Amino acid sequence: MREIVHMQAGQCGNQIGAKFWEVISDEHGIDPTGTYHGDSDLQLERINVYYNEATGGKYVPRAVLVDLEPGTMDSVRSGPFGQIFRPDNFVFGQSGAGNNWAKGHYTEGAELVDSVLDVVRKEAESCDCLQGFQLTHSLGGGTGSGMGTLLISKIREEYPDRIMNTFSVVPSPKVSDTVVEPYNATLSVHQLVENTDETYCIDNEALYDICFRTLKLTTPTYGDLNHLVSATMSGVTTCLRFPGQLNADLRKLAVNMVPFPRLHFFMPGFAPLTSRGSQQYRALTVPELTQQMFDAKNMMAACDPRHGRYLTVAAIFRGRMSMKEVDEQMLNVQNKNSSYFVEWIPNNVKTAVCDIPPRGLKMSATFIGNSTAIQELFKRISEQFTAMFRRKAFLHWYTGEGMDEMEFTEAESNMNDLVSEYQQYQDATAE
Amino acid sequence: MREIVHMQAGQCGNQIGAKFWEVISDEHGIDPTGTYHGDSDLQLERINVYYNEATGGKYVPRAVLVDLEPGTMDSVRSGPFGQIFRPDNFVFGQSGAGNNWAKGHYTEGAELVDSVLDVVRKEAESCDCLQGFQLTHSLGGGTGSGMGTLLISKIREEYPDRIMNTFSVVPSPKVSDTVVEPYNATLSVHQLVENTDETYCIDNEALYDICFRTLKLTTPTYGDLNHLVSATMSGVTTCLRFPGQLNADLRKLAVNMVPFPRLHFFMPGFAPLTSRGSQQYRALTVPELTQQMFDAKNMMAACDPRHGRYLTVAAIFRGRMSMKEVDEQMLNVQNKNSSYFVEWIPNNVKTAVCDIPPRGLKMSATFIGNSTAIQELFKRISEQFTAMFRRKAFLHWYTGEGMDEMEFTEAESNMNDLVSEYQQYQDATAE
Amino acid sequence: GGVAKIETNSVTPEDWQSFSNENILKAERDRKNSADLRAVVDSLLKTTADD
Amino acid sequence: MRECISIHVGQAGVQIGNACWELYCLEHGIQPDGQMPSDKTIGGGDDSFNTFFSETGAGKHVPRAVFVDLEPTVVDEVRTGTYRQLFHPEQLITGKEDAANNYARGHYTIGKEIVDLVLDRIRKLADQCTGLQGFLIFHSFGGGTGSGFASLLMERLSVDYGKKSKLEFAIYPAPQISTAVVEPYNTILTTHTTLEHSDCAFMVDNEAIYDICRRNLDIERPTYTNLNRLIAQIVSSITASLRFDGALNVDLTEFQTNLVPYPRIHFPLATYAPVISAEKAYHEQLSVAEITNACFEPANQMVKCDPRHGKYMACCMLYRGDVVPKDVNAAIATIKTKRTIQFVDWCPTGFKVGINYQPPTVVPGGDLAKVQRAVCMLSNTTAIAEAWARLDHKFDLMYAKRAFVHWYVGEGMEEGEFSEAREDLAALEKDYEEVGV
Amino acid sequence: MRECISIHVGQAGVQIGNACWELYCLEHGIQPDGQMPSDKTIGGGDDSFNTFFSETGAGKHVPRAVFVDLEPTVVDEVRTGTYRQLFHPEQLITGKEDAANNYARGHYTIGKEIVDLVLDRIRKLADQCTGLQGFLIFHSFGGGTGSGFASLLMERLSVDYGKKSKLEFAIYPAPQISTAVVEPYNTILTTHTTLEHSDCAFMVDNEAIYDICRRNLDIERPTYTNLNRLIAQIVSSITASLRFDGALNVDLTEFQTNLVPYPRIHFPLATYAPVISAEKAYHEQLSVAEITNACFEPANQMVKCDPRHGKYMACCMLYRGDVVPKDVNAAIATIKTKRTIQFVDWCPTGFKVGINYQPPTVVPGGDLAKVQRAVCMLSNTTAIAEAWARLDHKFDLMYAKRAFVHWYVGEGMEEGEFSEAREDLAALEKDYEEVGV
Amino acid sequence: KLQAKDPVSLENAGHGPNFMSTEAKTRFSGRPSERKDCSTLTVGPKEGSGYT
Amino acid sequence: LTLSELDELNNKRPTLTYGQAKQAPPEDFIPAHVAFDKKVLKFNGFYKQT
């Protein structure tokens, strides 16, 4: 009866959470009306982790949709699978900040925060065995960065023991999509380091590369982009919903994957992923699943674990497989590629096998990696931040509605401290 | 075979009594013509509480409809469910002041009181048990307050052993809509203190507050406010009419709320109250009912309950329930917010669980509070009255018919003693 | 009208077949025990007369 | 011969009586219309219903109960319900005005207009009875008719009858959970009245029964029906010695003699074992040692009262079913070797056991399971002084400022009976103290 | 008279217990609803189930097991699986939040929420035991509730009891295959309670069982179900001597007084023979001498440590099936003259022989063959120091820079616990090294 | 189905209570003591009652 | 490929993501004291005396 509360922040968070909720409703056999039309008892075995029994047979998702301006929530409500959400779980203000951390965290985000906190308190009271909170947002916005990090902080002092997951769409190394994006990313990870239990860094450049060099797909479309991220989201919380041979919840993943309290930025990965012209040329087996799971091209972040060092690895399998060959592949990957695994931790791969695969697949696997390669992303954001901060680019707003240069200085210092920590634990010796 | 004779006085009385009569006629299956079309024997077994059988198998409400001018009574005869009333208990005057307590209590009210008294004697002698009297008037006007308090004085002098509750829609600071509201309220609250056994004070700005934040409705108009008042009125006598696990009539409610004779000014509430768009998304349970009642934004009086202390709370639950959740929810509320309850009376909760919910709701509840925070409206009306009375304004309209200013001074003084008594029993400790 | 009355007792179509199958198998099981006892009684009716 | 007269007073009394008489009809095989099934038989004697049912002669088994209330709701609910042809219409008695949770209203104003008729019906029932074993008065200490008119009926019955026993089944308020604010006043007044006119006063709480139904019968949302079914099981296990036959038997007259030491301490606790649902019943042995331990568990009493905070004085244990007298005093020996269960020093032998070989009857569509063995425990511990002191503290809080006292003064009472009840209750505390020391 | 209570704590413990109890049910002829169709049993006579099952008196057989997890899952799979009716509802104790591979969570914060439920259930199962002989406890060292809560339960069980025999069947972490990260931390934090609260502890490696299934059973796709089946067969071969009748037979007291030389040296190797598929049993003779030789093989142990690097201190053989003590004497004579196996000089006779004539049973859908004879060889040997050495190397490698210690420190545990448990395991290694020189 | 029970929601199989239904009328239905049709079931061996 | 596979795509395929359905044992056991409760056989007799 463990259960988490989903929380979408920003327009990116709103679309990606709508995609996540519709795919998890497809997984649990929930119609767009809200009733149940599946074909097994295992779908209602653990329906309470994501859904609440409304009196009348309807299943309402345990989600809080937050936006500063009623923008993409209109699209969420007017699209398919958008009527399941409770209309009291949509929170909006009359203005809208947009790609501004200071307006999303101090001026406009400080007015909606009381209503969002009231809604989240109501959802957690509706919970009886709450596991934690799962917030989806993007680094490089105003509501996703500012309001999202404000929510993460507020719920951190509200519930200091529940497991806090963030799915953060991080800036890509190439193509900007926002010009104050280094500012928002730095000023948001300054909160994400010390206020989240685990953070999954996701970037559109690597996801587009997955969509072309892995699935071809000609036209990727953000529907399929958020589908890939939502498939990872469904994979990471599989043992909470279905029986398996080796259970591992979010607390288990955090315990086995976080060696030091600041080092909790992961690279997600989901790898049953085959181009439609090559479905006839592959065999869906555990060794091939492991190979494509540990392949560097499959990674959803632009950082290179070949350039870095794997501290910890979590592999969550789905399907009726053997245990011996799964364990053998996880040992064999390290025993061959021992230069990408730090050798002061022995057998740093955790295995979590669940019985039920997703619909349409014989087997599945999702990959959560805490490499030291993620320091390249923070190095990129740090130098892109200082190239602007050394000439006070776009800083007149951030000084206008109420910050100092000291906040940016502290955020840059915290990022560089994280980079130095990742470097020292990358090049630390065995003895 | 307990029964209540109903009285409507003034325009507000004849409107929110009409809505009350049609909602309990819907509960009892009475047609607008007057012929029964229900489905259960429970729906007729205690119909003698409010109805009189006539020759032809048609039920007549046991109500007396009083107004100084016969426009509102033509409107209430014309309204839906308006032809069930007798035409004999429709007492009208040719002239009539309106918004003048002196010309509703002393002049053109001293000769219509004989006719309404004759109708009251008729409807009281056409009875076998006569539980009591229910006046649904409103303070602020002339015939609502003056003629209403004259009726209460006459009834208390004639039958000083029957339960007798007035509701009153006591004036608000914001909606206003009448200049002489402080005079009209101050001249009648001391009469209510002296005579009335239960005063269920409702407020217009609080009703607007409910229909703005609690249930959206996007245009609350006036019928929805009356329907809230009517549902609150029907939720008190559900133990008189329908059977339940634990029963509490009007006399039991009076005994178990009022500790002292002068503190009988209750503040009511209702649950559940959902928006029309989010009614099928809610899990309606007894704990969530308690969540909705024990809240500042749900009370139908303008007072905030957090600004004082609860003396007693009545919870009249309706529906197929378990008594343990009712008891444990009341006890958790008391043990959590024990600072807001008086400590010299342990367990400040009266509980009555009836088995028949109102139509359309599976699981309902009626709130009654004897809070010491009811003194805010009295302090507000007192300061408005002394603002309009420090220099004698609008006073010739009251002193042109024999009223002295010493009456105004005595009413203000008695209202101040009511405020001081509420303050004393709030701040009194178990010494 | 029809009247809503829930259903209570109603069997799955493979439960209906399993009711008639286990009645036949129980009757066949008790029939061969009687046939075993018939050969016992017939045999001892010859031996006891011979002794 | 060996019959008792039931007096169900209050809404709690009437609903408890509904559960009790449903259980009695199911136990004796009597149909809801008071007839024998004829083509079906229930078995067991020729007069093993006469304790509760009087035979007309045509097969009509009218009971021996008086359902009385000053409210036409809960009793006309019985008159409308399925047991409409079982009760004599003059047994079911309704007033007009409600007592409104007021002892003064139920004892001085509304009780007097109906007390004459209810004693007339009681006189008719007792004259029908050959030799009466006693009265069983089912009510609640919470307030209204069950605290007022019930105590008035006790005073009038003690005046008119005298030596006949008047057993009480009292729904005593929980220390924390209550449904009224005048419950300390009503409880102290009705206890001061019944302290001088009762012979035994079996206490049953409500929060404790909620605890039993939650932990044992795993019902997370119990209503009053399950509580009343448990209380019906208590009273059926009490009177099964009178109804059926078997081993060691105890009658209601000297139930008291083997129960109450002094003519002040007549408030025994209650316990029933086993209380188990249909799932966790056929996976256990249900031995006599196990059910005695289940009776002696602190979180199994029928009243919210920890028995470890005080010594026992008497324990009357009524076993039902496949109970051999070897196992009863095998288990009682282990109880006596246990030192946490500590008895009072002036009572070396403190057990009275009664074994009937009739198992309890399970109700259809109920919650209890059909068990082969059962035991009902009646403990007379000193630990209930904690509940008495909680009642005293609540009465002090309410009576310090004279809250809800005009409602009692204006309907008959003087302002001396409150203080008299208070000093009587303090005297009861001191009597418990001298009994304990 | 005898019984053996089985506790199954952890996900691994419950998954061992599922196969264990299906094997026990098929051995004793008990259907999953909980009764035997017949009365007489092949081999043992009448009450040959009392070591594992208990009579309710009405014909229901309830196992003497306690299935405990700090998690709704897995125990809910048992509760809604095939054996939903065999198990008592209250002997399957579940928590709400898992310990999440944390010894601190499983031992200091959330273990002490249902440790008293499992202790009360143990005491209530022991009350139904006439003479209790064993406390067989099944868990894993992978972490979580199988380590921390197992340590807490073992500590409270050993201080409550202590005249009984608390045997362990632990899933020790394999040298190179492991499914978690903080496994050395959890194993060293829990090895103290296996050192000083255990009478005996049999630890297995998952990869050793994988290797014997891959080689002997010819399963290139082995699974935890197969692993639990082999472990259940080992436990059944250990406990068959109590329940089934036969020749010279060893109960737990004889076994563990002939197995351990010193109180701290109670950690024996486990081996089962003949682990064989059916299509290979068609070819093999499966004679006593060759199954004994198969027991004395390096690549046949349940734990990855080569026994040629140590001295065999003691060996207890438990034979089952078509086994004659003459054949056993011939097999022991064959083994004792082998130069590969060498013993300590302070054990002149080093074999304890138990014989049963009940062959092991097979499960439908199983993997082992229906062998006419079998043997479980349990050898106290000093060659297990390899596993402790590998575990201490892993733990020192992770503890050199304090990885994952913040979880344990913040979850109510002092930081010196790791150091003192490492010191205890170093002392255990020192004893096992210079016990056999 | 194997959780802690609710008589209200378990009324009318699993669809909750009925319209205009009271607690006494739903519970105290006056049903006779049922005699089990154990034709397809396997009755356990008799243990004997206290009279035996 | 044939374009009729678009119409064949809506076919019911045998769903097997949840594995084989585990067999369940029937509830065919009842204790004697619950099975034979309230069952009495009634007869009538002469009992002649001299």
Ligand SMILES: Nc1nc2c(ncn2[C@@H]2O[C@H](COP(=O)(O)OP(=O)(O)OP(=O)(O)O)[C@@H](O)[C@H]2O)c(=O)[nH]1
């Ligand atoms: N166990 C149990 N207790 C009940 C039941 N009904 C009411 N009570 C108790 O009765 C107390 C309230 O007093 P009532 O019995 O309702 O009042 P009354 O005796 O009918 O007299 P009035 O106040 O005039 O209605 C509550 O605190 C309940 O605990 C019931 O059905 N079962």
Ligand SMILES: Nc1nc2c(ncn2[C@@H]2O[C@H](COP(=O)(O)OP(=O)(O)OP(=O)(O)O)[C@@H](O)[C@H]2O)c(=O)[nH]1
């Ligand atoms: N032999 C065998 N080992 C198992 C099985 N299931 C789990 N394990 C072992 O258990 C170890 C992990 O601990 P778990 O049992 O899964 O977790 P737990 O004991 O329930 O404690 P938590 O982590 O809090 O859930 C792994 O290293 C496995 O080797 C099984 O079915 N058979």
Ligand SMILES: Nc1nc2c(ncn2[C@@H]2O[C@H](COP(=O)(O)OP(=O)(O)O)[C@@H](O)[C@H]2O)c(=O)[nH]1
């Ligand atoms: N994968 C994915 N990324 C998105 C989506 N919508 C927006 N983004 C990313 O979000 C970034 C812009 O941040 P934005 O969503 O405007 O932040 P906000 O203003 O707080 O909502 C861009 O870099 C986009 O790449 C989406 O549907 N899918």
Ligand SMILES: Nc1nc2c(ncn2[C@@H]2O[C@H](COP(=O)(O)OP(=O)(O)O)[C@@H](O)[C@H]2O)c(=O)[nH]1
């Ligand atoms: N609820 C309600 N309030 C009213 C109505 N009419 C006036 N009021 C409020 O009450 C005050 C005057 O009361 P009124 O109805 O005129 O009293 P009457 O003349 O005796 O009927 C005004 O300030 C209004 O705010 C009505 O029809 N219903």
Ligand SMILES: [Mg+2]
């Ligand atoms: Mg009543």
Ligand SMILES: [Mg+2]
């Ligand atoms: Mg687990």
